[PDB]
């Protein structure tokens, strides 16, 4: 018969088992604490190794992903986040002094003649 509950508690102590702890670590959730086209030519073409083209496609696609592992940026496809967007639009954040009619305080654009 399978051993009793208070039997495992003894076995856990005697053998120094840590499997129960490792399950809790795995379950540890941080939040809780806090086709448009079909090619006829593909199907009727076969190659030696015969295998039809459609199955040959999957063999190549599997081979391709081994060379290049699939990334996750392909799986995904007054507003609060307006300020985040405007920073993405430009990497120039200094206002153009050409429009300004007041000269800059500390930097003088002066050229010798």
């Amino acid at each position: 018969p399978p051993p009793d509950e208070e039997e495992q508690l003894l076995a856990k102590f005697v053998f120094g088992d840590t499997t129960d702890l490792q399950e809790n670590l795995a379950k540890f959730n941080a939040d809780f604490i806090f086709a448009a086209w079909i090619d006829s030519d593909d199907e009727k073409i076969k190659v030696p190794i015969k295998i039809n083209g459609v199955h040959y496609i999957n063999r190549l696609r599997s081979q391709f992903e081994k060379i290049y592992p699939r990334p996750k940026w392909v799986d995904d496809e007054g507003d609060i986040n307006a300020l985040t967007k405007i920073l993405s639009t430009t990497y120039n954040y200094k206002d153009t002094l050409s429009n300004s009619k007041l000269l800059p305080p500390k930097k003088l654009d002066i050229v010798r003649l």
Binding site: A26, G78, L83, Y93, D95
Partner: protein, 422 residues
């Protein structure tokens, strides 16, 4: 790569293995509570006995700590050695330790946290493996003795090299060296990521925000002369401010206001960035104290604008958002107080917005102008648009009264605007 360098990577991979007695003495002698001679004499059971009791005290103050009694402070954790685990088991172990360091971040002043974290130091060698997370969670405690003990037993990562002089020294690190650490661009990205995790977990607290705000504000000041470095500072700290504004915590929002205002004066920005800034400021205004801090921030930012469109009317969506979070009476009170900051550019742009979109509020325009003295060119812009109001909008007592107000004050300028327009 030389043979020594390849051996350096080997030495780091297994720094905590304790291959011999001399290695064991160094790893075990590290302690947050006791000195090295006593620490080497201690066994894990004695250490775990104190930590388990300390965790119970922390559980009373914060119930969340009781969860770690199941995983990190379990009796079976005495027998758990990270060196015999696999990749997957260590990642789970690292996640639990990082989560604990977030909770313990705000309770370092309490003595029990120092005993509870001793077990992680002695059993799991966090000072060797989770070294960046430990330092990050305790930056704002740089003056306390606990931070000083951390520096002694820890090997500073490459990004924390500024703190090396204060490892095993009499004096604690100064506030000036804190700024140097935060001055590094790489360190800012590292601290931004850590601060981001706190915001997601709602683990932020006032002392963290206060220290974080000072370092960010001082970092702008030291780079005031260098305009190029201020430009590189934009994607990082303004992105941080967007996250802090997104947080529901009012203390987080106030810190974003403080960061925004010091930057706005340090570097003049496009009006689009300023307008985008206020739309983020105004989206999540519910707290009264945040509401007070926001208005001063908004007035200050418009003061910095110094190009055409300086006092142009707000966009339609922008104006509608602002009046909802700030009634006309609330603004009148803001202008009423004698200690009001300079806000003429915003009030000029606010006044022109009213004429465009709100007809009933023209009577308020008369009250606003009396309360605050606007500059000569700003007065011209308001008159110029109100002239268009007469042509398009029907004549009104408030509309003519607004003109009569300009008749009383500086009559000659009123003619010039009429002369140029009609």
């Amino acid at each position: 790569s030389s043979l020594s360098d390849q051996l350096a990577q080997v030495a780091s991979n297994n720094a905590t293995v304790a291959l011999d007695r001399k290695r064991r003495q160094k790893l075990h002698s590290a302690s947050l509570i006791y000195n090295s001679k006593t620490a080497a004499t201690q066994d894990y059971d004695f250490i775990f006995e104190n930590a388990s009791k300390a965790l119970e005290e922390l559980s009373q103050i914060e119930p969340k700590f009781a969860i770690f009694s199941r995983t990190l402070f379990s009796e079976s954790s005495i027998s758990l050695d990270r060196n015999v685990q696999t990749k997957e088991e260590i990642k789970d172990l690292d996640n639990a330790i990082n989560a604990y360091l977030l909770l313990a971040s705000s309770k370092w002043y309490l003595a029990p946290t120092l005993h509870a974290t001793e077990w992680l130091v002695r059993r799991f060698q966090i000072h060797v493996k989770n070294t960046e997370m430990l330092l990050l969670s305790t930056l704002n405690y740089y003056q306390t003795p606990v931070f000083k003990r951390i520096l002694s037993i820890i090997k500073l990562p490459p990004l924390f090299n500024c703190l090396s002089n204060f490892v095993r020294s009499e004096k604690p690190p100064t506030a000036l060296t804190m700024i140097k650490l935060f001055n590094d661009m790489d360190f800012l990205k590292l601290y931004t990521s850590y601060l981001d995790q706190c915001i997601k977990h709602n683990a932020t607290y006032t002392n963290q925000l206060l220290f974080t705000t000072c370092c960010f504000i001082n970092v702008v000041a030291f780079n005031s002369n260098n305009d190029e470095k201020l430009n590189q500072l934009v994607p990082i700290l303004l992105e941080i401010s967007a996250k802090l504004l997104a947080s529901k915590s009012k203390d987080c929002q106030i810190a974003a206001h403080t960061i925004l205002v010091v930057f706005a004066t340090a570097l003049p920005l496009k009006k689009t960035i300023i307008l985008a800034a206020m739309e983020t400021i105004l989206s999540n205004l519910d707290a009264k104290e945040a509401k007070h801090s926001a208005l001063l921030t908004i007035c200050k930012l418009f003061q910095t604008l110094k190009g055409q469109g300086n006092v142009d009317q707000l966009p339609s969506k922008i104006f509608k958002l602002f009046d909802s979070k700030f009634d006309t009476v609330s603004i009148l009170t803001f202008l009423d107080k004698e200690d009001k900051p300079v806000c003429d550019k915003f009030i000029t742009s606010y006044t022109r917005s009213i004429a465009r979109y709100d007809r009933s509020k023209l009577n308020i325009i008369l009250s606003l102008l009396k309360k605050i003295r606007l500059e000569r060119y700003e007065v011209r812009l308001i008159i110029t648009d109100l002239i268009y109001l007469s042509e398009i909008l029907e004549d009104k007592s408030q509309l003519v009264e607004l003109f009569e107000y300009f008749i009383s004050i500086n009559e000659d300028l009123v003619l010039k605007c009429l002369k140029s327009l009609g």
